[PDB]
Amino acid sequence: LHKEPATLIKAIDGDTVKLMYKGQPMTFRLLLVDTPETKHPKKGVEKYGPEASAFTKKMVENAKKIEVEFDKGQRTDKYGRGLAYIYADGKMVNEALVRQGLAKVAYVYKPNNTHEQHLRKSEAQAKKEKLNIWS
Numbered sequence: 429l430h431k432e433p434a435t436l437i438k439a440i441d442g443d444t445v446k447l448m449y450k451g452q453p454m455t456f457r458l459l460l461v462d463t464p465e466t467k468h469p470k471k472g473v474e475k476y477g478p479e480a481s482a483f484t485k486k487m488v489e490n491a492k493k494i495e496v497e498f499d500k501g502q503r504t505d506k507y508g509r510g511l512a513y514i515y516a517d518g519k520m521v522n523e524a525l526v527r528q529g530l531a532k533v534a535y536v537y538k539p540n541n542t543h544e545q546h547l548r549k550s551e552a553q554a555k556k557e558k559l560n561i562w563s
């Protein structure tokens with residue numbers, strides 16, 4: 429996998445952010461995780477939804493550099509959102525969320541699962557420390 433630069437446009441929620449990529453505005457959906465819903469009515473505003481959003485926001489807004497890393501399978505989901513691992517000053521947002529108990533490992537679709545084990549170890553640690561979601 430290779431990282432490429434992107435510029436923040438706006439953080440939408442814990443797992444969705446709008447970025448300028450290759451000179452174009454796009455919405456990215458974080459690969460392999462799911463932060464609680466703050467938007468869809470069919471879901472409501474789930475617990476930690478707001479916390480997860482704040483965490484991501486803070487993380488991307490305060491970063492010097494943002495980078496996107498596409499996996500080896502499809503790069504967009506059926507809604508047209510780019511599917512990537514996003515890094516803030518070299519720190520993976522996807523993992524930071526899981527490590528804090530602010531997201532669960534979800535939507536594992538081969539071959540897009542290069543960092544699945546890594547994300548899975550962080551999640552177990554978050555679970556064993558009973559953080560947020562796991563509290």
Ligand SMILES: Cc1cn([C@H]2C[C@H](OP(=O)(O)O)[C@@H](COP(=O)(O)O)O2)c(=O)[nH]c1=O
Pocket residue numbers: 443444457458459460461462463505506511535537540
């Ligand atoms: C993360 C991810 C989500 N999606 C789809 C699965 C879900 O579709 P459905 O809308 O049918 O549930 C949705 C989850 O996104 P959200 O958490 O943003 O709702 O996005 C993919 O297709 N591939 C992915 O890699």
Ligand SMILES: [Ca+2]
Pocket residue numbers: 443462463464465
């Ligand atoms: Ca979500």
